[PDB]
Write a protein that binds this ligand. Structure first.
Ligand SMILES: *Cc1cc2c(cc1C)nc1c(=O)[nH]c(=O)nc-1n2C[C@H](O)[C@H](O)[C@H](O)COP(=O)(O)OP(=O)(O)OC[C@H]1O[C@@H](n2cnc3c(N)ncnc32)[C@H](O)[C@@H]1O
Ligand code: HEM
Ligand SMILES: CC1=C(C(=O)Nc2ccccc2)SCCO1
Ligand SMILES: O=C([O-])[C@H](O)C=C([O-])O
Ligand code: SF4
Ligand code: F3S
Ligand code: FES
Ligand code: NA
Lengths: 588, 122, 105, 238
């Protein structure tokens, strides 16, 4: 060992909602736990989540976790694993009430109970009347959630390694994951964090696109880490494009706007969601709403101006009082980024890359999965994932608003509840050898030694433009094949990219270069997967295969890093507490 | 050991902060001034000769200038101190706006007292 | 504790504000300042008491205030305690010298 | 149109002390960017320039800076609000904190003051609710203006009292947080919290300088929160 070794029962990589929940739980369950984050924990993307948490509390009206299950399975266009979705919606209420007891400042009904608002994909009685089940703190729910969780972690004295950058997983000779190496951003010191359970909770990767609602820090580090370790990633082609990013800025305005009564208009003032989704209207699922807006634009019914092509999101009829009380956050965002006051004018919006349905496949326990040569699932000893980085999968081909925050909490908690069983089940793991650790550092070492290589800024811009043009809302056989080819070129350039800042004290260039490798693996995996799935389901839409194919594609797609090829995994359809919801035609 | 950015000449201070630093400075000045006023008072009271002697000291233009400074610093500490206490007791609002208005009115009131002081001393 | 300071500093500031209104009153309404009308004012029981009260008030109010300043700008312990010593003695001197000047009138 | 900057630089393995460096940036005339857009662009041309950022929407609190002498977030400060004919745009680290590198400050003492006031729900468990704690809208409104804090440190790093005693004075942001728990109806440790805030320094170093309010990117008002704490302290100890 020529590298300091810091040993813990668990190392949680990421301190967003998922990671902070898991750490809290792992800790209370009596094991030692290091919580790593490449930013101060309260600056993780969860902080920006607006609309709230979808969960059947039954406060605004009688509800039923089975109704929420139906909505989610239907919303996922039938490739969401039903046993896992069952677990989420049934467990949810308890998990969310628990956050309220940690002090989360929810908004309130007149009787004192948690406020819930309508949101997209919400129905009573299995597809009936519109429901209101998203629990909220104005439109700052993610902020409220994240701060509350950090506070709980302070109160529990969690051991937090703030501003450490995880480089790569460390594997032992048996193929088990036994921790990871990380770079302390302040000092430059590199360390091996040794663990019996390494929990990836690194969030999404919207920055592979040219326009995203995601923070700059969403670079798919978890995807890249898994891939480089030989761990497969799943459903990578399933990218949710939120319907309402601010045109010309990418900054999100919550679906809360529509849940509170706002709606979308085109250049002629048609409320076109009545035409495209006669039932749920503006509160239809996101894949559908996003496509609808893009069709309106492509056919010359979109609007224009300083912001570029867009649809109008009309809110002014809700009134100043309701706007300032339930939606203060988008008031600020619209005035600042669009120069539009929502109280008097519609907000210029356009679909914007938002959330990553794909990720590392996991069981409900958070344990990461791989497949052997016969295609059977095999647990990866030592590895776990929770949150946006994971693909459980509870979101299938299209996530419901409100369901990500629920996911972080339910699954972060679950990984913690189950960690002891998971560690016992996997057995003692053999120590990493010195070169096992050294292998983790190869990628870092290349950057440190490359001075005259290519400019990483040009590579990132090419990467992002490629994804924007070829793997956006509508996709095409030809364009995707060409995009994939360009990525291969871009990816070769990156193996020769230079790092111009060579210093060690808070050197952010090195971090951003390291990040770019992860943008690249994520983009590549996405593209290979998008070409592979020759059908249209949820957010994945192709003109060359416009239809949903339940005979050939009622399944997850799986990217295998060693061979760089694709395969399939079953979708689970065996809930324990009620019968499976059978695949059927999905319209809103 | 790590540097710190605390170069006061590179930082903007709003009126409220100016008001506040002056309140502190005026208070220190007043503390010294009390001794001086006492020194003067005691002279002026010890005998009829002490009194004329005090008048003669008050005659000097240099002394009038200082005595004016003392009275001005005192008026300032007092007025701005009352502003402070009106905030503490809820008579003045604590928004940034309210804080700007009240600082300004305080300056104005002080300038007036400073003249009434100048007159009293001339 | 700090609630104690907060209050005493303000109580004394109220007393001192009254004393200033009183002394300003006098000075602003007497014109010709002969040695006799002067000594007459300060001979008055009212003025003697009020003045001694003011001196006590300055003792407390300025002690608190100067303490606040010192504990912001004077870090080294020894230099600070010395400056506190000087300042406290000065303030006490003020009150005592005040007693000797007025009881002598 | 040409944009000119004077930016604070410091790297302990190169520099003996801090220094200001000049920067130029061709900008599109007909379009107005944020300071963070500029910073990110400057880095493309000088890769060694370090600064913090993330959400780029004024929510995460990463990129507090001192801009033309006044604190704020780069990500929501438009260039047009900083630009003056024949002057440079001057960018320096938040004042009073140790500087790690370039525009990156060590926020440790800021986070320490936050922890000192115990920023988490303290509930004694008696009279548990059937489900969520019931909190009426009137009681919930008391939290508005307090929970929105993004821990950016714009306020505290602009407070002289915090500069002189960063380890004794809690500072505006922290006291804002303390009040958030002091008036949460669900928190039952109000008295005990106040007993820990009674010394000469924690709260009382705040003397209404009011630099906190003007810089808060979220439009919060520490002065007012502090005022309320002071009342509670008197109601209890006087
Ligand atoms: C983008 C977005 C998403 C969003 C939303 C609003 C916006 C603007 N509003 C939502 C809502 O109202 N309801 C809901 O259910 N979901 C909403 N979303 C989606 C959701 O917020 C995100 O999926 C979710 O917040 C992700 O949470 P998660 O815990 O999974 O991840 P994160 O918040 O980004 O945290 C990432 C952490 O990982 C650390 N990290 C990343 N890479 C590294 C490396 N290399 N080393 C060490 N740490 C790393 C980050 O520091 C961070 O701590
Ligand atoms: C008579 C001689 C006086 C002297 C020598 C004096 C001195 C001081 C000093 C040194 C301070 C501390 C300064 C700081 O913390 O910045 C102070 C604070 C203060 N002064 Fe006075 N003062 C006098 C009279 C008065 C009067 C009449 C008032 C009434 C308005 C007053 C109002 C205040 C108030 C309210 C504070 C409190 C601010 C705090 O608690 O920090 N002072 N004084
Ligand atoms: C700490 C404090 C003051 C302070 O030091 N103000 C200040 C000092 C230097 C530069 C600007 C303002 S003035 C009001 C009393 O409390
Ligand atoms: O519209 C939102 O608030 C947000 O985008 C919600 C989720 O769940 O992602
Ligand atoms: S109160 Fe305002 S300035 Fe102070 S830390 Fe919070 S958001 Fe930042
Ligand atoms: S800027 Fe500082 S002194 Fe008090 S009102 Fe403010 S915390
Ligand atoms: S970058 Fe998140 S606040 Fe400016
Ligand atoms: Na995912």
């Amino acid at each position: 060992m020529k590298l300091p070794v810091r040993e813990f029962d668990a190392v949680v990589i990421g301190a967003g909602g998922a990671g902070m929940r898991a750490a809290l739980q792992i800790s209370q369950s009596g094991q030692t736990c290091a919580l790593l984050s490449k930013v101060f924990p309260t600056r993780s993307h969860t902080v920006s989540a607006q609309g709230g948490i979808t969960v059947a509390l039954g406060n605004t009206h009688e509800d039923n976790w089975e109704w929420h299950m139906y909505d989610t399975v239907k919303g996922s266009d039938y490739i969401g694993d039903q046993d896992a979705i069952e677990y989420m919606c049934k467990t949810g209420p308890e998990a969310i009430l628990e956050l309220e007891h940690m002090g989360l400042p929810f908004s309130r009904l007149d009787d004192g109970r948690i406020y819930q608002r309508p949101f997209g994909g919400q129905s009573k009685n299995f597809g009936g009347e519109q429901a209101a089940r998203t629990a909220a703190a104005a439109d700052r729910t993610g902020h409220a959630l994240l701060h509350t969780l950090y506070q709980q972690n302070l109160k529990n004295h969690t051991t937090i390694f703030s501003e450490w950058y995880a480089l790569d997983l460390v594997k032992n000779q048996d193929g088990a994951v036994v921790g990871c190496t990380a770079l302390c951003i302040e000092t430059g010191e590199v360390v091996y964090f040794k663990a019996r359970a390494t929990v990836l909770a690194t969030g999404g990767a919207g920055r592979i696109y040219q326009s995203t609602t995601n923070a700059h820090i969403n670079t798919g580090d978890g995807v890249g880490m898994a891939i480089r370790a030989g761990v497969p990633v799943q459903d990578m082609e399933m990218w949710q494009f939120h319907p309402t990013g601010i045109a010309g800025a990418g900054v999100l305005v919550t679906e809360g706007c529509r849940g509170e009564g706002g709606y979308l208009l085109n250049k002629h003032g048609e409320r076109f969601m009545e035409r495209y989704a006669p039932n749920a209207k503006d509160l239809a699922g996101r894949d559908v709403v996003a496509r609808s807006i893009m069709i309106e634009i492509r056919e010359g019914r979109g609007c224009d101006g300083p912001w570029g092509p867009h649809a109008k999101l009309k809110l002014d009829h809700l009134g100043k009082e309701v706007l300032e009380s339930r939606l203060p956050g988008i008031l600020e965002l619209s005035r600042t980024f669009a120069h539009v006051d929502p109280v008097k004018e519609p907000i210029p919006v356009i679909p914007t890359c938002h959330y990553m349905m794909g990720g590392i496949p996991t069981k409900v326990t958070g344990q990461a999965l791989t497949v052997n040569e016969k295609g059977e699932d095999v647990v990866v000893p030592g590895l776990f994932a929770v949150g946006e980085i994971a693909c459980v999968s509870v979101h299938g081909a299209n996530r419901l608003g409100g369901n990500s925050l629920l996911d972080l909490v339910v699954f972060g908690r679950a990984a913690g509840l189950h960690l002891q069983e998971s560690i016992a089940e996997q057995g003692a793991l053999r120590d990493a050898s010195e070169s096992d650790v050294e292998a983790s550092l190869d990628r870092l070492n290349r950057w440190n030694n490359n001075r005259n290589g290519e400019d990483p800024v040009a590579i990132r811009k090419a990467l992002q433009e490629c994804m924007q043009h070829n793997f956006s809302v509508f996709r095409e056989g030809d364009a995707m094949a060409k995009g994939l080819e360009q990525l291969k070129v871009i990816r070769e350039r990156l193996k020769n990219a230079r790092l111009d800042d060579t210093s060690s004290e808070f050197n952010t260039q090195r971090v951003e270069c390291l990040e770019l490798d992860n943008l690249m693996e994520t983009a590549y995996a996405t593209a290979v997967s998008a070409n592979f799935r020759t059908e249209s389901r949820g957010a994945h839409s192709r003109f060359d295969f416009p239809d949903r194919d339940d005979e050939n594609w009622l399944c997850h797609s799986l990217y295998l890093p060693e061979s760089e090829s694709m395969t399939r995994r079953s979708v689970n359809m065996e809930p324990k507490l009620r019968p499976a919801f059978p695949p059927k035609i999905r319209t809103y | 050991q790590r540097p710190v950015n605390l170069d006061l000449q590179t930082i903007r201070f709003p009126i409220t902060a100016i008001a506040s630093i002056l309140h502190r400075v005026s208070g220190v000045i007043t503390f010294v001034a009390v001794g001086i006023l006492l020194w003067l008072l005691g002279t002026s009271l010890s005998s009829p000769e002490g009194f004329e002697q005090a008048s003669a000291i008050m005659g000097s233009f240099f002394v009038k200038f200082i005595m004016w400074g003392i009275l001005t610093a005192l008026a300032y500490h007092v007025v701005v101190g009352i502003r402070h206490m009106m905030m503490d007791f809820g008579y003045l609002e604590e928004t940034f706006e309210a804080g700007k208005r009240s600082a300004k009115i305080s300056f104005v009131i002080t300038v007036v007292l400073s003249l009434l002081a100048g007159v009293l001393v001339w | 504790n700090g609630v104690h300071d907060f209050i005493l500093v303000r109580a004394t500031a109220i007393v001192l504000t009254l004393y200033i209104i009183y002394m300003v009153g006098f000075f602003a309404t007497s014109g010709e300042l002969t040695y006799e009308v002067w000594i007459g004012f300060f001979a008055s029981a009212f003025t003697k008491v009020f003045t001694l009260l003011a001196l006590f008030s300055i003792l407390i109010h300025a002690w608190i205030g100067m303490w606040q300043v010192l504990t912001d700008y004077v870090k080294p312990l020894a230099l600070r305690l010395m400056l506190q010593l000087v300042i406290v003695v000065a303030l006490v001197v003020y009150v005592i010298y005040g007693f000797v000047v007025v009881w002598g009138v | 149109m040409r944009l000119e900057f004077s930016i604070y630089r410091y790297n302990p393995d190169v520099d003996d002390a801090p220094r200001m460096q000049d920067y130029t940036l061709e900008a599109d005339e007909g379009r107005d960017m944020m300071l963070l857009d500029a910073l990110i662009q400057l880095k493309e041309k000088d890769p060694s320039l370090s600064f913090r950022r993330s959400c780029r929407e004024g929510v995460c609190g990463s990129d507090g800076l001192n801009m033309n002498g006044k604190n704020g977030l780069a990500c929501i400060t438009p260039i047009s609000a900083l630009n003056q004919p024949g002057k440079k745009i001057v960018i320096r680290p938040l004042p009073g904190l140790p500087v790690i590198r370039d525009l990156v400050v060590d926020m440790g003492q800021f986070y320490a003051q936050y922890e000192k006031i115990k920023p988490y729900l303290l509930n004694n468990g008696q009279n548990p609710p059937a489900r969520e704690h019931l909190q009426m809208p009137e009681q919930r409104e008391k939290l508005d203006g307090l929970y929105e804090c993004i821990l950016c440190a714009c306020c505290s790093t602009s407070c002289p009292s915090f500069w002189w005693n960063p380890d004794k004075f809690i500072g505006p942001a922290g006291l804002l947080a303390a009040y958030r728990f002091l008036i949460d109806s669900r928190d039952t440790e109000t008295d005990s919290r106040l007993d820990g805030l009674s010394d000469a320094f924690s709260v009382f170093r705040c003397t209404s300088i009011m630099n906190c309010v003007s810089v808060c990117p979220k439009g919060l008002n520490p002065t007012r929160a502090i005022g309320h704490i002071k009342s509670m302290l008197l109601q209890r100890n006087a």
